[PDB]
């Protein structure tokens, strides 16, 4: 893992593994700054396809295609934790990927993620591994009711989790563990969730975006408010500083946190990428999480601080939100609508987002509650 790495000048080519909306927004920043973009994704309808100079259609495990990507690019970054750590290690060894493979390897798997966090001395939710039927006996013992079982590999947006309140829930849990190795952790009484988006670049440079406050609905990110209405910035940074001694990050990554009914901070999970809770920074900050991602990865200097120019309330737009709202869009320029361009609408698929700049966050928050039902 190089502390110092290639400084790439405009005109160089950036490779992106993954063409979802995160890749798309990375590629829009990259093209604005004068970098060329090659993007790799299995789907020919991927949102990033028409903001790339070149599109390589292939699966994320496809070694020939990943090598072709490396042959075309001066730096390679990734948009989602999809890829196998083993494939990515091979690629880091042959091409320029300052992000390395450690972040991905370790954060792919919930157990390894939890272990690392505890071992870095961060405040983690008490946790235990459960791959078998009997290991749940240990979880009832070692954590107590309530507690929650999560798949350790597949999970995104609330999927692959079973909340276990009483023993009349164990039935639904066994049904998940019989199909996938899992982890269990205490179910907390959470009053707020926050996250801290960060960028790390050349020669140990680091920058922090404003702390963001996150409400979920059906375990999917629903609403992000910035600045977070609870003061946890300093404690959040302390945890990041611990995390950074144990896992190599370059470019943007995001740490999600829980705060107790008793105002206690725990690290929940880390995304080694730009993150849904950072999208607001496009309109609200003097740099977005994608701008700094490109700066970092191409080995440029990072700004020392990020300014929030105006506070903001960002709403995700799932397919069902479009069903409800799309006919109102045209009368609401203050929604700053982002529509990713995905061709197949589904009720829970993230189809876009909206960012409402506001001087009165609490009011705007009300406005949005009424709007989303």
Q: Which of 33, 85, 190, 361 binds its own copies (CB under 8 A)?
A: 33
Tokens of 192: 């707020």
Under rule CB under 8 A, which residues in 45-64 are in contact with its own copies? 50-53
Q: What is the DSSP string of 144-159?
A: -SSEEEEESSS--TTT
- 331 is in the binding site of which of ligand ADP, its own copies, Mg ion, none (Cβ under 5 to 8 A by kind)? its own copies
User: Shortest CA distance to 251 belongs to which of 45, 90, 96?
Assistant: 96
Contact between 210 and its own copies by CB under 8 A: the answer reads no
Contact between 75 and its own copies by CB under 8 A: the answer reads no
Q: How far is the CB of 114 from Mg ion (least distance, A)?
A: 14
Identity of the residue, 253 or 340, whose beta carbon is nearer to its own copies in the bound complex:
340
- 72 is in the binding site of which of its own copies, ligand ADP, Mg ion, none (Cβ under 5 to 8 A by kind)? none
Under rule CB under 8 A, which residues in 82-111 are in contact with its own copies? none
Q: How far is the CB of 183 from its own copies (least distance, A)?
A: 38
The footprint of its own copies on this chain (CB under 8 A) covers a number of residues equal to 44
Contact between 159 and its own copies by CB under 8 A: the answer reads no
Contacts with ligand ADP by CB under 6 A lie at 125, 148, 150, 155-158, 185-188, 190, 193, 216, 219, 256, 268-269
Under rule CB under 8 A, which residues in 291-350 are in contact with its own copies? 292, 295, 299-303, 307, 309-310, 326, 329-334, 336-341
CA dihedral 293, 295, 297, 299 (to 10 degrees): -160
Whether the Cβ atoms of residue 136 and residue 170 lie closer than 8 Å to each other? yes
Q: 170-177 and 135-142 helices cross at what angle (nearest 10)? A: 130
Whether the Cβ atoms of residue 54 and residue 72 lie closer than 8 Å to each other? yes
Q: How many CA atoms lie within 13 A of 169 on its CB side?
A: 13
Partners of 267 in beta bridges: 124, 257
User: Shortest CA distance to 259 belongs to which of 313, 336, 194?
Assistant: 194
Q: How far is the CB of 340 from its own copies (least distance, A)?
A: 7
Tokens of 291: 């701008």
Q: Which of 12, 20, 28, 77 binds its own copies (CB under 8 A)?
A: 28
Q: How far is the CB of 260 from ligand ADP (least distance, A)?
A: 8
Tokens of 65: 């295609």
Partners of 221 in beta bridges: 216
Identity of the residue, 197 or 298, whose beta carbon is nearer to ligand ADP in the bound complex:
197
The CA distance from 10 to 22, in Å, is: 21
- 10 is in the binding site of which of ligand ADP, its own copies, Mg ion, none (Cβ under 5 to 8 A by kind)? its own copies
User: Shortest CA distance to 92 belongs to which of 107, 82, 77, 81?
Assistant: 77
Q: How far is the CB of 102 from ligand ADP (least distance, A)?
A: 20
**In 3-state terms, what secondary structure has residue 305?**
coil
The CA distance from 160 to 152, in Å, is: 9
Q: Which of 2, 4, 34, 44 binds its own copies (CB under 8 A)?
A: 34
- 148 is in the binding site of which of Mg ion, its own copies, ligand ADP, none (Cβ under 5 to 8 A by kind)? ligand ADP
Q: How far is the CB of 86 from Mg ion (least distance, A)?
A: 25
Q: How far is the CB of 187 from Mg ion (least distance, A)?
A: 13
Q: Which residue is nearest to Mg ion (CB)?
A: 216
CB neighbour class for 32 (10 Å; exposed up to 12, middle 13-18, buried from 19):
exposed
The CA distance from 106 to 103, in Å, is: 6
Q: How far is the CB of 204 from Mg ion (least distance, A)?
A: 28
Whether the Cβ atoms of residue 41 and residue 18 lie closer than 8 Å to each other? yes
Residue numbers at the binding site for Mg ion (CB under 5 A): 216
Residue numbers at the binding site for its own copies (CB under 8 A): 7, 9-11, 24, 28, 31-34, 36-37, 50-53, 283, 286-287, 292, 295, 299-303, 307, 309-310, 326, 329-334, 336-341, 352, 357
């Amino acid at each position: 893992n190089a502390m110092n790495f290639n400084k790439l000048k405009f005109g160089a080519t950036i490779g992106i593994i993954g063409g979802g909306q995160l890749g798309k927004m990375m590629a829009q920043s990259a093209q604005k700054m004068g970098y060329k973009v090659v993007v790799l994704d299995p789907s020919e309808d991927c949102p990033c396809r028409y903001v790339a100079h070149e599109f390589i259609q292939a699966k994320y495990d496809d070694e020939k295609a990943l090598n072709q990507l490396g042959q075309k690019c001066d730096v390679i970054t990734y948009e989602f934790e999809n890829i196998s750590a083993q494939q990515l290690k091979l690629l880091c060894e042959k091409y320029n990927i300052p992000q390395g493979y450690q972040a991905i390897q370790l954060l792919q798997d919930r157990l390894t993620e939890k272990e690392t966090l505890k071992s870095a001395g961060t405040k983690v939710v008490p946790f235990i591994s459960v791959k078998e039927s009997t290991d749940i006996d240990k979880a009832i013992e070692t954590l107590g009711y309530p507690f929650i079982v999560k798949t350790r590999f597949g999970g995104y947006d609330g999927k692959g989790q079973v909340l276990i309140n009483n023993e009349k829930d164990l039935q639904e849990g066994f049904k998940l563990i019989e199909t996938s190795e899992c982890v269990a952790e205490k179910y907390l009484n959470i009053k707020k969730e926050v996250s801290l988006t960060v960028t790390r670049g050349n020669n140990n440079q680091i920058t922090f975006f404003p702390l963001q406050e996150n409400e979920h609905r059906n375990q999917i990110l629903f609403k992000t408010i910035v600045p977070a209405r609870i003061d946890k910035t300093a404690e959040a940074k302390e945890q990041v500083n611990k995390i950074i001694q144990s896992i190599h990050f370059i470019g943007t990554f995001t740490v999600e946190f829980f705060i107790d009914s008793n105002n206690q901070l725990y690290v929940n999970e880390i995304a080694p990428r730009p993150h849904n809770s950072g999208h607001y920074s496009i309109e609200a900050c003097d740099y977005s999480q994608f701008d700094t991602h490109i700066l970092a990865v191409t080995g440029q200097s990072l700004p020392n601080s990020i300014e929030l120019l105006k506070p903001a309330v960002m709403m995700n737009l799932l397919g069902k939100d479009l069903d409800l709202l799309e006919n109102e869009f045209n009368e609401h320029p203050e929604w700053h609508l982002h529509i990713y361009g995905k061709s197949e609408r589904k009720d829970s698929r993230k189809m876009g987002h909206m960012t409402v700049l506001t001087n009165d966050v609490n009011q705007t928050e009300q406005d949005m509650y009424a709007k989303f039902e």
